[PDB]
Amino acid sequence: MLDAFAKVVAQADARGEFLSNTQIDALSKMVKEGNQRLDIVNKVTSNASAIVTNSARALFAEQPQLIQPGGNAYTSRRMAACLRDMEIVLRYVSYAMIAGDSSVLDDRCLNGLRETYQALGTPGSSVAVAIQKMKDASVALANDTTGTPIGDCSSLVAELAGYFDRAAVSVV
Amino acid sequence: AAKPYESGYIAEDDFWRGRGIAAWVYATGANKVIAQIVKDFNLTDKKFMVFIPNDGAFARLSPQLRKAMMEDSRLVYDMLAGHIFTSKGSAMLKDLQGAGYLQPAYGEAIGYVGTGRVIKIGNAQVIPESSDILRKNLGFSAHTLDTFIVPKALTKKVSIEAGFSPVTPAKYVSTTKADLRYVGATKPAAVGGRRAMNLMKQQPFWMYGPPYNAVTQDEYEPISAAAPKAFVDYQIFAPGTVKVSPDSVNANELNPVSGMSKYIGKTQKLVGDQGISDRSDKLPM
Amino acid sequence: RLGTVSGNSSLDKLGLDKFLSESNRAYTPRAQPGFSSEYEQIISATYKQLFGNAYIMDSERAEMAKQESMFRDGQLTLKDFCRALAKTEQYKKRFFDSRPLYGAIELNFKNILGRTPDGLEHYRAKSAVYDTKGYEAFVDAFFDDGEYDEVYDDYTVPFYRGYKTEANLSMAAFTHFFRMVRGSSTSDKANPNSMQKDIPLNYYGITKTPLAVIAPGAAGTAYTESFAGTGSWQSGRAGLNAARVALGVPATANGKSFRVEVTGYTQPGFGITAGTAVGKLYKANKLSRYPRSNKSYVVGFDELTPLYQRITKNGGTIASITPL
Amino acid sequence: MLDAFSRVVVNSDAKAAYVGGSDLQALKSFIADGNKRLDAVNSIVSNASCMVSDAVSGMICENPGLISPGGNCYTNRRMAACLRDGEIILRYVSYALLAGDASVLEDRCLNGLKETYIALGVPTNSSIRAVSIMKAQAVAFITNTATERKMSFAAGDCTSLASEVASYFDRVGAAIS
Amino acid sequence: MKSVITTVVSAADAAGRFPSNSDLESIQGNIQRSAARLEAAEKLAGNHEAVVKEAGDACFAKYAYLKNPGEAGENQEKINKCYRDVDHYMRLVNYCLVVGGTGPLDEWGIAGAREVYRTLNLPTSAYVASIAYTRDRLCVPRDMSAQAGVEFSAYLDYLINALS
Amino acid sequence: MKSVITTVVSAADAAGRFPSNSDLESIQGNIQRSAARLEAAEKLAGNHEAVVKEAGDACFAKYAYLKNPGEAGENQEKINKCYRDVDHYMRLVNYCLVVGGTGPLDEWGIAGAREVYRTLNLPTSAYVASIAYTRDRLCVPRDMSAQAGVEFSAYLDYLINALS
Amino acid sequence: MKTPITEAIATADNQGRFLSNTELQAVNGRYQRATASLTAAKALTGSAQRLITGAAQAVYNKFPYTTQMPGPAYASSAIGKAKCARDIGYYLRMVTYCLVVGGTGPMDEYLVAGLEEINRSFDLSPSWYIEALQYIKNSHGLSGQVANEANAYIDYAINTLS
Ligand SMILES: C=CC1=C(C)[C@@H](Cc2[nH]c(/C=C3N=C(/C=C4\NC(=O)[C@H](C)[C@H]4CC)C(C)=C\3CCC(=O)O)c(CCC(=O)O)c2C)NC1=O
Ligand SMILES: C=CC1=C(C)[C@@H](Cc2[nH]c(/C=C3N=C(/C=C4\NC(=O)[C@H](C)[C@H]4CC)C(C)=C\3CCC(=O)O)c(CCC(=O)O)c2C)NC1=O
Ligand SMILES: C=CC1=C(C)[C@@H](Cc2[nH]c(/C=C3N=C(/C=C4\NC(=O)[C@H](C)[C@H]4CC)C(C)=C\3CCC(=O)O)c(CCC(=O)O)c2C)NC1=O
Ligand SMILES: C=CC1=C(C)[C@@H](Cc2[nH]c(/C=C3N=C(/C=C4\NC(=O)[C@H](C)[C@H]4CC)C(C)=C\3CCC(=O)O)c(CCC(=O)O)c2C)NC1=O
Ligand SMILES: C=CC1=C(C)[C@@H](Cc2[nH]c(/C=C3N=C(/C=C4\NC(=O)[C@H](C)[C@H]4CC)C(C)=C\3CCC(=O)O)c(CCC(=O)O)c2C)NC1=O
Ligand SMILES: C=CC1=C(C)[C@@H](Cc2[nH]c(/C=C3N=C(/C=C4\NC(=O)[C@H](C)[C@H]4CC)C(C)=C\3CCC(=O)O)c(CCC(=O)O)c2C)NC1=O
Ligand SMILES: C=CC1=C(C)[C@@H](Cc2[nH]c(/C=C3N=C(/C=C4\NC(=O)[C@H](C)[C@H]4CC)C(C)=C\3CCC(=O)O)c(CCC(=O)O)c2C)NC1=O
Ligand SMILES: C=CC1=C(C)[C@@H](Cc2[nH]c(/C=C3N=C(/C=C4\NC(=O)[C@H](C)[C@H]4CC)C(C)=C\3CCC(=O)O)c(CCC(=O)O)c2C)NC1=O
Ligand SMILES: C=CC1=C(C)[C@@H](Cc2[nH]c(/C=C3N=C(/C=C4\NC(=O)[C@H](C)[C@H]4CC)C(C)=C\3CCC(=O)O)c(CCC(=O)O)c2C)NC1=O
Ligand SMILES: CCC1=C(C)/C(=C/C2=NC(=C\c3[nH]c(/C=C4\NC(=O)[C@H](C)[C@H]4CC)c(C)c3CCC(=O)O)/C(CCC(=O)O)=C2C)NC1=O
Ligand SMILES: CCC1=C(C)/C(=C/C2=NC(=C\c3[nH]c(/C=C4\NC(=O)[C@H](C)[C@H]4CC)c(C)c3CCC(=O)O)/C(CCC(=O)O)=C2C)NC1=O
Ligand SMILES: CCC1=C(C)/C(=C/C2=NC(=C\c3[nH]c(/C=C4\NC(=O)[C@H](C)[C@H]4CC)c(C)c3CCC(=O)O)/C(CCC(=O)O)=C2C)NC1=O
Ligand SMILES: CCC1=C(C)/C(=C/C2=NC(=C\c3[nH]c(/C=C4\NC(=O)[C@H](C)[C@H]4CC)c(C)c3CCC(=O)O)/C(CCC(=O)O)=C2C)NC1=O
């Protein structure tokens, strides 16, 4: 895997170039955010059990056929594996948020997830609804203050929303 | 420095401010360089020819090239020395005809193609509407370009993959009355209480139907299970105080010819609204 | 775009998006004298179909300038032009003279008929025309059997139909179609399973065994495997590809069996450490950790989630999962 | 193949939602900035021949081992195909700029282009550099910063269109890698 | 989707050429016509539950035989699926005014519909009587403007001619 | 004959469908953009005798070696056929403005040209160099209107990319 | 690639848990040191050609046989001199990559993995590249903690070569 600092280095080694003066000034801004990025990863991780469970609770209220006999989440092994997958996706979205690059997200979670759910019969349109419910539980948790100093984080919540949309289109 | 309208515009340093085609040479410090070029190559006696790029040519200059003209003052020197030509002297536009070559002040030689009224100097084009101005004293000809004469021998050091590939940031478009609903689902259900089912949204009206059976938010409330033993008697009140009112006094709105009735029977759950509720009013209890 | 959900469509995002959008139907028996733009589009469309999106340069396109002019007044485009272009040297050089007979036989099924050979008897009926009468009648049996006038109007260009259900083929022929047609930016020179020299469906087209379909543009889209016998009688060798059967006690202990195909295995990235190991880089015997990339596994269901993490954490790319 | 308007339709169809209110304003902005998009697609297809030849020549000038015996662009059949491999890639990028969505570029071009280039043996580092040169040419004609041509436009800013078409060219390098 | 963009792109892809001057001239028609057909798509998306339910019982006001035994409006589930299937069709007309062509109606509503409404024995003249009621309910200055009602009704009788 | 009308009629015929609402919208863009190009073509009509004379001198100025004995511009008779062959290209772009697309260039001027010129030993770079001159002496608010110059330039670059 | 960011992800993904404050502090310390490292990398980039021409000449002064002996391994001809100023620029570019990333990651993946195998095969001496690196440690002109970050990756490559 490689983060956002290693991303521009790998793009520059393949050209055989030193980094520019403009490119160092663009990596100073990524360090200048710095603490605001670590606030989003702190808020998402600290409420990780309640984000997964209460957005599974709201999925079975709107799609109650998934827990009927003959549904894809009806049994204890088949329900516990469903909550386990929703915690796997929230894990690698927080990994992609601390790194600034969606490379650990697809190389270790997403590549082969569509092929897995097509061999098992898991409804892929219902997985993306569970992904989109953890999204707006987390982008509403991102832009509340709650012991953070007041400022503008609207550029880092568009990046966190883009990692949830990436995980949702790799399964739908 | 001073105002350009002093001494008329007869001064050489103030004339190009007056003939306002090249305003970038005084907005930047480019006019110090071309005065230092003709010191350095002794062009003050013999006649020559300049091709000044206009305003708009400086504006269409690329951001991967305009950065490299700032971090390398040697690159600004020979680019401005690449516009001063000493082949034909004070040459007009009619002597720039056919195809041929031209010797710059510093750089290796630049080919021109001049075909009638369109004249190219090699990645440049002379706009001939204002290009035949000749100064008598310190004598040269000045013609106007629309692009800088950029030789390819200078700019193998530049590229767009340095970091000048343009990127726009996209931000999320959520409304503040919607993510205030969604923060209550982040807490666990022992401390979030009735707010733990806040993530369910409004289904369409057929999704609560008997094939699909989507559960409303009100089954998760205790207001669905309000089934008491006690009951109001309604006969112990004064006559005229018990009020009742029907929904519509019509046979055809209470029940249509199909069973899609909003008021009678089990099809009262098939409303397009009334899927979610306001239980972020109270408490996290 | 990939997937099956989000658009309510599966075949256009399986590589067939350009092919599901054209007719190229030549609505008039002769080209009108005076205009060339409508019929130049049909000739460029029947070059792209009959040659399988190959590059015909201008020095080679001038070698078929005669037929192109017989078609513009006095020949059909389905018959008599695709038949004329199949007897040319440009078709014969890259589709017949390069491969064996059974390799040339299924390239003609794709190019002329738009499908794949179903079984051995589809191969065997077409090799018998070549053994008795030569190449000139061999390409006529694709045109002059019953199938060709049945499925194509004799003024349209041929189109791909080996995936459809009205082309009454076996379901192993569906999986074989997506081995020979990989999207619209590919030819059979640009196919890794036939590189204008091979037999693309050699064991699989004869025995009618089905393959796992990998979509073009997927993550593990670069997965290819070799072929080798395994038994003592055919003098085979063990340990190259995983089996396709799941026979014994391990088939149903640990649940239902699957067959997983991995693509990219490199020397950097094995350990639990985010970076390469510095030092010696190779053990004594000088071999890699994975001597082949493109490995395959046969795994149970209770071992599928430990294996999934063992693949991706060590650099591999899951190409396909298929229940045995 | 989806355009910009039909992209928000397949996003609304996933949740049985009508298109209206919040989503129609981002599509009414597409119409209001729609004259710029036609005025920018015209700038690329007017120079589409000089763009391709200069991209394959500049790929060769920096890496002159490609025209040696053993290089991929050696003979005349190989050089004419490399000049046509890039003329198609530029054609599909100009479709995605006209549509406003990268679905026609991914469906018809990039899906399968990777295993095209590993069967033929095309060097992916050299083909990325040829795309990179086309990216710098496309931003220069859109933002009028071309040093060899000066196209006429109305006055205004089109940075969002240049950052859009730059993201289409980076999908080409990420696919074939 | 069949649209204005996807038509002129596919026509210039089968010919193998760049976007010409006539392919940019068609997208200018998509600009001057978008004002009328986005007004109809916004008027419909705000008041869709009242337009669907007004047309759902215009089926049963013309065909009261559908409540007979064995028919398609017997029980509560079958009228829930009937008001759903009308709301599906009104969503696709909202999708066609947004895209600008008959794309979403063709791929999602019309293709395969004759083989489903005959196998399941749903009378196709009653999936029409709800669509034909909405086309004559529209008052041309009251709900929308003049050219917004031209676009709204032209997608409404494309669906009628495709079921007939 | 690629036009805006010809592209949608041929695409409705390829799918066997009637003219939809996605097809009449493309004819609307032909109406709006018509006033731009139809007065550029009026400008090219009455002033073609001087535009080809200016463009004719602009290729023998660049390639003065054509007047050598043994080249394509030896005598006055071979010179007269070059001013004729550039007057044809100015008539075929006058046709492309009133049609609305690259039809009349694609049929009578471009298709077949690169084998006529190769066989008859005529350098295509000099058939280019007179087309790129009238693209360059055109300044947009003097010679025509601001939008007529966009259409007039759009066909000259289409002719240049075809020869080059 | 080894980075303070990616080594925190890899040690939590190996255990299979979420990013705790054990991992949020390891990337907080990368952000504190990043200001010294980014000024050390902007200065080594802008004075690269001075440091490349000087360090190659500093090897020809200590080992003058490398400009004398015939053979392909030595910098006798103009071809072996051009392949030496290319090798110094590889060692210098990996140092500025390690300062930008924040760890000894880019010079592990690109330079020091397989380094003892390509030196023994093509018959290059690691003592040539040490003296080329002692020059850059003595001539970058940096001061304080800016020089502490630059000399930490220069001293890392000298330990692998020796
Ligand atoms: C190891 C654990 C660790 C953390 C969790 C963070 C925590 C943290 N955040 C900030 C500092 C900050 N944090 C934020 C972030 C926000 N403010 C808001 O109103 C938004 C809701 C939210 C963005 C999503 C902002 C905006 C600042 C800077 C205050 C300012 O400049 O206005 C600071 C002080 C730095 C400063 O003041 O500049 C610290 C220590 N840093 C750490 O080292
Ligand atoms: C632990 C102890 C405990 C209680 C005391 C009750 C308290 C209580 N009552 C209501 C909810 C309510 N409570 C009332 C009651 C009244 N309104 C009146 O006009 C009368 C004055 C009064 C009855 C005598 C009504 C009418 C509602 C429904 C409110 C509504 O949604 O309209 C709710 C909201 C939850 C729900 O709607 O189900 C709660 C927590 N519940 C508890 O769990
Ligand atoms: C729809 C999209 C679409 C494409 C992108 C191309 C993709 C493509 N390119 C080539 C074929 C080729 N492509 C290249 C290109 C290159 N080699 C290099 O060294 C350069 C890096 C690069 C030029 C930029 C070359 C040289 C060949 C020919 C290889 C050969 O002839 O052996 C072929 C095989 C041609 C054939 O089989 O006859 C195909 C399908 N075709 C398409 O239909
Ligand atoms: C080895 C030999 C060699 C070459 C052939 C050129 C090739 C070349 N051209 C450009 C760069 C460019 N190329 C063009 C294209 C054009 N400009 C015009 O004046 C014409 C209208 C049109 C086709 C001729 C444009 C517009 C740019 C960017 C800026 C500009 O020149 O105005 C770039 C930079 C790409 C980048 O930034 O990464 C390169 C390498 N350079 C070389 O070193
Ligand atoms: C009618 C069909 C049609 C064409 C023939 C072409 C031509 C064209 N371009 C623009 C108009 C424009 N074109 C641009 C684009 C640019 N300007 C710049 O300074 C950049 C260099 C470049 C890309 C960012 C801009 C900024 C406008 C102004 C109008 C607007 O902002 O929408 C207009 C609108 C001007 C008017 O209202 O009269 C037209 C008709 N585009 C079309 O839609
Ligand atoms: C996205 C596009 C889209 C559509 C247009 C619909 C099309 C459609 N409608 C129905 C299904 C139906 N349509 C009706 C309709 C009626 N009953 C009557 O008495 C009247 C004839 C009429 C009301 C207008 C009924 C009753 C069913 C259910 C059939 C059944 O219960 O067997 C079905 C069968 C599947 C099901 O059970 O829902 C389908 C595919 N579905 C779609 O996905
Ligand atoms: C989105 C799609 C859409 C439509 C197709 C129309 C359709 C429509 N019309 C009416 C409602 C009505 N429509 C009319 C008709 C008319 N009134 C006049 O002043 C004219 C003379 C005449 C035009 C023919 C009348 C008189 C009513 C009120 C009576 C009724 O409930 O139908 C209603 C009920 C809501 C209401 O207006 O109270 C609806 C949905 N409106 C929409 O929103
Ligand atoms: C109606 C559409 C139409 C066209 C577009 C042209 C195209 C065209 N031009 C020429 C023909 C020609 N084109 C040139 C041109 C040149 N020679 C030079 O010295 C310069 C290189 C260049 C000046 C522009 C000459 C000299 C001929 C005549 C060839 C000859 O005499 O051998 C011919 C051969 C027949 C002839 O005219 O003799 C044709 C078909 N003619 C058409 O009928
Ligand atoms: C329909 C075809 C058509 C063209 C291709 C051009 C071509 C053209 N330009 C000029 C004539 C001219 N063209 C210009 C050029 C310009 N003037 C300015 O104000 C701008 C700065 C600049 C635009 C580049 C000038 C200054 C003259 C007069 C001098 C001359 O060239 O004789 C003439 C002679 C007639 C005249 O205008 O006096 C012609 C035919 N005009 C046309 O009608
Ligand atoms: C790299 C980390 C990783 C990934 C990505 C992963 C995917 C994965 N998901 C699985 C199952 C599953 N995934 C789901 C999930 C769902 N089904 C639904 O109905 C819902 C819509 C949805 C979630 C709420 C279910 C129900 C199963 C069990 C399927 C079965 O047992 O048949 C299995 C089968 C093994 C098992 O857990 O029993 C794997 C390997 N496993 C991993 O270790
Ligand atoms: C679930 C338990 C199970 C089954 C069903 C099974 C079948 C099985 N039979 C095999 C071989 C074999 N099977 C036969 C059997 C025969 N050949 C003949 O000519 C006769 C007609 C016939 C029996 C009389 C032979 C000869 C081989 C060796 C094949 C060879 O080496 O070429 C092999 C290949 C492995 C090997 O060579 O040992 C398998 C997997 N193996 C199992 O573990
Ligand atoms: C069973 C005995 C055996 C074979 C046959 C074998 C081949 C083999 N060669 C490999 C890589 C390689 N092979 C080359 C070889 C070359 N590249 C070039 O440009 C040259 C033309 C050419 C030789 C000079 C390179 C550069 C790699 C590394 C590619 C990479 O890791 O990205 C790899 C990938 C894993 C690794 O990095 O070691 C394998 C498995 N490994 C084995 O254990
Ligand atoms: C980015 C990581 C990287 C490193 C470290 C690297 C080193 C490297 N240096 C090499 C050669 C060389 N290195 C030198 C350098 C020297 N010899 C002298 O006499 C001087 C004392 C000294 C320089 C100061 C010379 C002369 C050769 C050519 C040797 C040959 O061709 O046999 C070669 C042989 C391949 C070739 O010919 O290019 C490699 C792989 N390559 C890499 O890609």
Swiss-Prot record, chain D:
GO terms for biological process: photosynthesis. It is found in: Plastid, Chloroplast thylakoid membrane. It comes from the Eukaryota. GO terms for cellular component: chloroplast thylakoid membrane; phycobilisome. Contains two covalently linked phycoerythrobilin chromophores and one covalently linked phycourobilin chromophore. The keyword Electron transport applies. (2R,3E)-phycoerythrobilin 1 binds at residue 82. SUPFAM superfamilies: Globin-like. It is a peripheral membrane protein. Gene3D superfamilies: Phycocyanins (1.10.490.20). Keywords: Antenna complex, Bile pigment, Chloroplast, Chromophore, Electron transport, Membrane, Methylation, Photosynthesis, Phycobilisome, Plastid, Thylakoid, Transport. Phycourobilin binds at residues 50, 61. InterPro entries: Globin-like_sf, Phycobilisome_asu/bsu, Phycobilisome_asu/bsu_sf. Light-harvesting photosynthetic bile pigment-protein from the phycobiliprotein complex. Heteromer of 6 alpha, 6 beta and one gamma chain. This is B-phycoerythrin beta chain. It comes from Porphyridium purpureum (Red alga). The lineage of its organism: Eukaryota, Rhodophyta, Bangiophyceae, Porphyridiales, Porphyridiaceae.
